[PDB]
Structure formats: C-alpha cells, structure tokens
Design a protein around this ligand. Structure first.
Ligand SMILES: Nc1nc(=O)c2nc(CNc3ccc(C(=O)N[C@@H](CCC(=O)O)C(=O)O)cc3)cnc2[nH]1
Ligand SMILES: *[C@@H]1O[C@H](CO)[C@@H](O)[C@H](O)[C@H]1NC(C)=O
Ligand SMILES: *[C@@H]1O[C@H](CO)[C@@H](O)[C@H](O)[C@H]1NC(C)=O
Ligand SMILES: *[C@@H]1O[C@H](CO)[C@@H](O)[C@H](O)[C@H]1NC(C)=O
Ligand SMILES: *[C@@H]1O[C@H](CO)[C@@H](O)[C@H](O)[C@H]1NC(C)=O
Ligand SMILES: *[C@@H]1O[C@H](CO)[C@@H](O)[C@H](O)[C@H]1NC(C)=O
Ligand SMILES: *[C@@H]1O[C@H](CO)[C@@H](O)[C@H](O)[C@H]1NC(C)=O
Ligand SMILES: *[C@@H]1O[C@H](CO)[C@@H](O)[C@H](O)[C@H]1NC(C)=O
Ligand SMILES: *[C@@H]1O[C@H](CO)[C@@H](O)[C@H](O)[C@H]1NC(C)=O
Length: 342
C-alpha cells in the first residue's frame, strides 16, 4: 500500500449547508453528436478522410444528461463560513458502461455565484470530482452515499492544476459534522483561494486535505496525479472499465480544441465498478470575491452504432446516432446512398 500522508489532525469537519433548490437550474446542454459531442475516438485504430459506421460506447443523441454545479461557500466579509453544496452525495447512480462529461461549456459567459443568486460574475471552468466503487450503503445516521471497501476517488486539486486518482478504503471520521459524527449533512471538498491559490505556489494538496478531514484513507493501492495547466477551454472527460482496469479519457491532450476523447490513463481497478456519485466541492472565498463556476454535465455511455466522419487530419468532426430515429438509421445504411460509407 502507498503512503498518502498522515491522517488529518483537524478535530472536526467544516459544516456543510445543503440547499438543493439553489442548485436547481434549467441550463440545458443536450448531446448533439453532429458536433461530435461526447465521442470517444475508436480506441485501437485511427481513421482519416473517411466516413464509417462503428460499434462503440456512445451517449444518446439529444440526451440531456445530469447537470452538476459547484458554488462559493458561505461568508461574511473576509471570513469564510459554512460550505454551500447541492444534495449530490446522497444520489448514488449506476455506473453501467461508464459515462462522459462536458466540462466548462459556459466559461467566459455571465452567470450566477449561486450562493447569492442575484450576484453575477464571469463564468470560469471548474473540474468535476467523482466517487466510484463496488458496493454502497448508508452512513451511521442513515444518510445514503457511503461507499464500502476499496473506493476510487477522482479529485481535482491545486486550484484546478491537477487531477488526483486514488483507490482506498474510506473510513468516515468521527468528529463534529464528519460522516461518523454529530450533525452530519454531507461530505464535501473545499479549497480557500486566499491561501491556496496564491500566484507563486498553489496548494496542490488543499482539496485532498479537505477530503481527509471527512474520511481516513486506508490501504491505498495507488495515488496518481495528472498535471493540468490553466485555461478556459471546454473539455470532455470519459471513464470506462474493462478487464484491463479503469480507463480515463480526455480531449485535453490530443484534441484540445475539437473535443474528441482519447485515453490518457489506465487505473489498476479490477473490481467491477457498479456505482458512482459526484463529490460536491465548495470554494471558501471571501464574500466580495466570489466567482461563477461552470456547471458540468454527465451522460451515460451505451453500446451503440454511430456514423463517424473523420477529417483529413484524422479527427471526428461529425457523427450520427444511427438508432436515434428512422431518418438517422438511413444515414448508416450502406444501401441508401445518403452517405458515402466505407
Ligand atoms: N455558476 C453558473 N454556472 C453555469 O454553468 C451557468 N450557466 C448559465 C447559462 N446556462 C445556459 C445553458 C443553456 C442555455 C440554452 O440556451 N439552452 C437552450 C436549449 C438547448 C436545447 O435544449 O437544445 C435554450 O433555448 O434554453 C442557456 C443558458 C448561467 N449561469 C451559470 N452559472
Ligand atoms: C500531499 O499529496 C501527496 C500526493 O498524493 C502525498 O504524497 C502527500 O503525502 C500529501 N501531503 C500531505 C501533508 O498530506
Ligand atoms: C479526402 O477525400 C476527398 C473526398 O474523396 C478527396 O477529394 C480528397 O482529395 C481527399 N484528401 C486527401 C488528402 O486524401
Ligand atoms: C437528498 O435527497 C434525498 C433523496 O431525494 C432526500 O431523501 C434527502 O432528504 C435530500 N437531502 C437534502 C438535504 O436535500
Ligand atoms: C439506506 O437508507 C435508505 C433511505 O432511508 C433506505 O431506503 C435503505 O433501505 C437503507 N439501506 C440499508 C441497508 O439500511
Ligand atoms: C469490506 O471488506 C471487508 C473485508 O474484505 C469486509 O469484512 C466488509 O464486510 C466489507 N464491507 C461491507 C460493507 O461488507
Ligand atoms: C489493510 O490491510 C491489512 C493487510 O492486508 C489488513 O490487516 C487490514 O485489516 C486492512 N485494513 C482495513 C481497514 O481493512
Ligand atoms: C507537474 O507540476 C509540478 C508542480 O508544478 C512539477 O513539479 C512537475 O514537474 C510537473 N510534471 C510534469 C510531468 O509536467
Ligand atoms: C473562453 O475564452 C478563451 C480565451 O478567448 C478561449 O480560449 C476559450 O475557448 C473560451 N471558452 C469557451 C467555453 O468559450
């Protein structure tokens, strides 16, 4: 097992204010595969200057997915207070074939800082966090969302300049507001920009430290880190699992400006992932310097046959969900003539 640093010495957990109605929004970003939304590139091949049909894992055309948003926490002036989160931890979902994620799509536009609904700001990309595992249950106080045995956690850190991936047993700590203590509402992560995101030295452990206040990590088989540099370019992230382990996908390395998803990591996770949840994050900003953080959208993958159109340089710029309707199915027919198919 790997060392992930000592246990948190913090006596209690930061209090967490759950107010789902403040996170109920109508911000639709449905899958449009004609724009190659949510496309994992064929994993074992490359294609170029050609139109094919291909059996892969894809989201449904038009699927709205599940929207998630992170918010600045409570504050009075320069003093951050309670965290402010949605009810995501108690909403455990089926992993099935995995999923893909639209990240940062609203960045640069104007949005709300959520905690103060009428306060507006320029929207900034924020990365999502996930808890995934084999079996789930309830915390001591009866709340849902506890992952048992070894659990995969994907957690951004360093103010969005790294993604952490680790596989540990999560032992809920017993302090005040912790998942095995009094007055528990939800776990969450946080960072504090005034001390964690100073220009010179970002705190690359701030989010992990916050997580370790809610859970003690035990018998970690791995702790991986992947560097990210700062920009506001939207991205796609995907995850699947085969016998080879858990596969992480991103557009950042290979198709930063186009969105196609390519594998960048394979995690030694061989117990079947059956469940996942979204880990709420709350930013401990001062009241006067709150930001608007772009919602991300999660879409489940399904075994589907897609038409895939590859540009000359080899990237997918157009797709069709063959099974979406009869007209779409004709595009994927080698006899119809609506497309020139290989
Ligand atoms: N903090 C924060 N995060 C955000 O992501 C955010 N996003 C918005 C804006 N979100 C959206 C998203 C989609 C549409 C939109 O134009 N949707 C179409 C329908 C698209 C379809 O269903 O095909 C529409 O006409 O409403 C508008 C605003 C505003 N404040 C925010 N604030
Ligand atoms: C910070 O994170 C790294 C990478 O996971 C870990 O090795 C280290 O022990 C952590 N430091 C502390 C003080 O927890
Ligand atoms: C790509 O295919 C088109 C359509 O057949 C053709 O006109 C074009 O010359 C091809 N480009 C290259 C670089 O092969
Ligand atoms: C979270 O969602 C569950 C399921 O709908 C519900 O029973 C629970 O009361 C919710 N908690 C909060 C704080 O909204
Ligand atoms: C966990 O809590 C939910 C909500 O009350 C309940 O329906 C479910 O039966 C509980 N599971 C166990 C194993 O007690
Ligand atoms: C987690 O694993 C241990 C040992 O492998 C087992 O005793 C325990 O029952 C497991 N968790 C649950 C909720 O069963
Ligand atoms: C961690 O592993 C050791 C040896 O495999 C085992 O004795 C111990 O019980 C494990 N810890 C937990 C919390 O299961
Ligand atoms: C990742 O970032 C850290 C901190 O800036 C740096 O020390 C390390 O060399 C970087 N790794 C890569 C592969 O760029
Ligand atoms: C936001 O603006 C930057 C700089 O102009 C650009 O690189 C990025 O693609 C934009 N992001 C979105 C989601 O429009």
């Amino acid at each position: 097992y790997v060392d992930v640093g000592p246990d948190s010495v913090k006596s209690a957990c930061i209090e967490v204010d759950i107010q789902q109605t403040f996170f109920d929004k109508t911000w639709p970003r449905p899958i449009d595969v004609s724009k190659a939304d949510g496309i994992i590139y064929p994993q074992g091949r490359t294609y170029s200057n050609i139109t094919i049909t291909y059996q892969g894992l894809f989201p449904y055309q038009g699927d709205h997915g599940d929207m998630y948003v992170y918010s600045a926490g409570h504050a009075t002036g320069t003093t951050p207070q309670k965290l402010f989160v949605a009810n995501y931890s108690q909403d455990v979902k089926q992993f099935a074939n995995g999923f893909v994620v639209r990240i940062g799509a609203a960045a640069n536009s104007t949005g709300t800082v959520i905690i103060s609904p009428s306060t507006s700001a320029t929207i900034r990309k924020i990365y999502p966090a996930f808890m995934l595992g084999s079996s789930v249950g309830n915390f001591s106080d009866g709340k849902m969302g506890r992952f048992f045995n070894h659990t995969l956690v994907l957690l951004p850190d360093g103010c969005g300049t790294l993604l952490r991936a680790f596989y540990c047993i999560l032992e809920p700590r017993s302090g005040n507001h912790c998942p095995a203590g009094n007055s528990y509402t939800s776990f969450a992560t946080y960072h504090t920009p005034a001390t964690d995101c100073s220009d010179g030295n970002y705190n690359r452990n701030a989010s992990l430290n916050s997580f370790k206040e809610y859970f003690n990590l035990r018998n970690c088989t791995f702790m991986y880190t992947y560097n990210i540099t700062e920009d506001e370019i939207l991205e796609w992230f995907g995850i699947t699992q085969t016998a080879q382990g858990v596969h992480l996908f991103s557009s950042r390395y290979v198709d930063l400006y186009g969105g196609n998803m390519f594998q960048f990591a394979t995690l030694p996770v061989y117990d079947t992932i059956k469940y996942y949840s979204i880990i709420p994050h709350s930013i401990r900003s001062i009241q006067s310097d709150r930001k608007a953080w772009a919602a991300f959208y999660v879409y489940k993958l399904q075994p589907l046959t897609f038409l895939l159109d590859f540009s000359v340089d080899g990237y997918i710029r157009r797709a069709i969900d063959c099974g979406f309707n009869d007209l779409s199915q004709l595009h994927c027919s080698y006899e119809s003539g609506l497309e020139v198919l290989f």
